[PDB]
């Protein structure tokens, strides 16, 4: 089996930079080509045979590469670049693919604002309590969010889940919720969200009392 | 014009077949290849096998076994059967032709596959009520399978929407937030419903989000 390793598996790159990835491959190939892919849609082609551009891929795109080790190149990284690029062997079966490069932009530094949502009136009724902790717009991605229920530290009762890169802004957001039973959130009152990230000197809470 | 449209059933129990149809159109089955790649949910892409014009077939030998490809050129029709389903056969599929290079040149949507054994399950739909700027949101708890789509006022709000991907929880279900900023000024004269659709359960269901 050709594996196709990629380099590097996530990259960023300010409004024109030059970006280069790498395809490596296990045997030797005389041709490699490339698909561009958005956000869980569709792959397109962008590249066929190394170097030839498939219809509609700008001319800041190029490929190279021979034998063992073939690339992508952009000239100057542009905002709707923004994709996952898989390498593609059709040389010998099985046909291969890489493992993707994610290819994402670079900006400022951006603090999270941070929101804490009680569990609705609605939920309550029906046996169990979630509890949503909110940060938005932040960049980079690398954002710690604890939990506090009357001052005891949780672990393992909630999870993270994370948007995609902003495509006005290029920021990120996250939600962190905390499950409980009905019955243990209604013997407890102070629930709180310590978030750390980068962007902030000191570490941010949110809470609210339960009444 | 080249089109290719997969249809399949979007949740099939291990052991049974899964079976997807292909209809393409805008290039003749006799003289040209269709492959078929997969993606499993949040990885990279895998081929499975091709039907080339002369009706042969290679596959991909992890699979060499349990997977056939066939077609019908009249009906403009190529079908894939898998047989034995795993847990891990719970993927998008694709089908594709190759044109340039004998590269994959035109895609499919694709069709999500979810191999479990479970029955389908409707969210219920609570509301994340606001406390400059305010949030707001709906959570979406306990479905099964995905996908569910939210939109806020039938479409008419997308300025400051972040709908998240969802997350799976420990009874097994699916469970997905979508919150919105606005002005808090708003939070008086405005009015936001979240307009979240289950396919699979047949579930529709409208939130009206208010202040708390
Ligand atoms: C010819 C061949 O061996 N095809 C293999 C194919 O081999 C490729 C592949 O490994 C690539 C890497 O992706 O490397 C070589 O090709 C190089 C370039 O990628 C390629 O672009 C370039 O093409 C030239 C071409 O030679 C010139 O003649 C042309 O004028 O210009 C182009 C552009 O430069 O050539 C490069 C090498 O010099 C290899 O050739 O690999 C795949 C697997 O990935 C298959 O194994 C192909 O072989 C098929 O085998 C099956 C049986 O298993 C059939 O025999 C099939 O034939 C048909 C079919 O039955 O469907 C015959 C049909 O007539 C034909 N239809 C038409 C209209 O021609 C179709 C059709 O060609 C395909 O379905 C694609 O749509 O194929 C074999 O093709």
């Known amino acids: 089996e050709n594996v196709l390793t990629q380099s590097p598996a996530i990259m960023s790159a300010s409004p024109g930079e030059k970006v280069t990835m790498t395809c490596s491959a296990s045997?030797?190939?005389?041709?490699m080509h490339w698909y561009q892919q958005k956000s869980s849609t569709s792959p397109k082609l962008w590249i066929y045979?190394?170097?030839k551009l498939a219809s509609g891929v700008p001319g800041r795109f190029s490929g190279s590469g021979s034998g063992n080790s073939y690339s992508l190149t952009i000239r100057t990284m542009e905002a709707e670049d923004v994709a996952t690029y898989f390498c593609?062997?059709?040389?010998?079966?099985?046909?291969?693919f890489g493992g993707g490069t994610k290819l994402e932009l670079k900006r400022t530094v951006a603090a999270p604002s941070v929101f804490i949502f009680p569990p609705s009136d609605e939920q309550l009724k029906s046996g169990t309590a979630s509890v949503v902790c909110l940060l938005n717009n932040f960049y980079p991605r690398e954002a710690k969010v604890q939990w506090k229920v009357d001052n005891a530290l949780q672990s393992g009762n909630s999870q993270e889940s994370v948007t995609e890169q902003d495509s006005k802004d290029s920021t990120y957001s996250l939600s962190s919720t905390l499950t409980l039973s009905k019955a243990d959130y209604e013997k407890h009152k102070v629930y709180a969200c310590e978030v750390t990230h980068q962007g902030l000197s000191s570490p941010v809470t949110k809470s609210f009392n339960r009444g | 014009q080249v089109q290719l449209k997969e249809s399949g059933p979007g949740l099939v129990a291990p052991s049974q077949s899964l079976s997807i149809t292909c209809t393409v159109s805008?290039?003749?089955?006799?003289?040209?290849?269709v492959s078929w790649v997969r993606q499993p949910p949040g990885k990279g892409l895998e081929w499975l096998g091709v039907?080339?014009?002369?009706?042969?077939?290679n596959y991909h030998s992890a699979l060499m076994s349990r997977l056939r490809i066939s077609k019908d050129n009249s009906k403009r029709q190529v079908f894939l059967k898998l047989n034995s389903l795993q847990t891990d056969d719970t993927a998008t599929y694709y089908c594709?032709?190759?044109?340039?290079?004998?590269?994959?040149?035109?895609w499919g949507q694709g069709t999500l596959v979810t191999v479990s054994s479970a029955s389908t399950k409707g969210p219920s739909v609570f509301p994340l009520a606001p406390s400059g700027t305010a949030a707001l949101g709906c959570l979406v708890k306990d479905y099964f399978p995905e996908p569910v789509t939210v939109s806020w006022n039938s479409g008419a709000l997308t300025s400051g929407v972040h709908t998240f991907p969802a997350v799976l929880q420990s009874s097994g279900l699916y469970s997905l937030s979508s919150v919105v900023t606005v002005p808090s000024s708003s939070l008086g004269t405005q009015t936001y419903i979240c307009n979240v659709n289950h396919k699979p359960s047949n579930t529709k269901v409208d939130k009206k989000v208010e202040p708390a």
């Open positions: 593609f062997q059709a040389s010998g079966y099985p046909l291969t």
């Open positions: 039907i080339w014009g002369d009706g042969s077939t």
């Open positions: 805008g290039f003749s089955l006799n003289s040209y290849g």
């Open positions: 594709t032709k190759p044109g340039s290079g004998y590269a994959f040149a035109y």
């Open positions: 045979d190394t170097s």
């Open positions: 045997s030797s190939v005389n041709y």
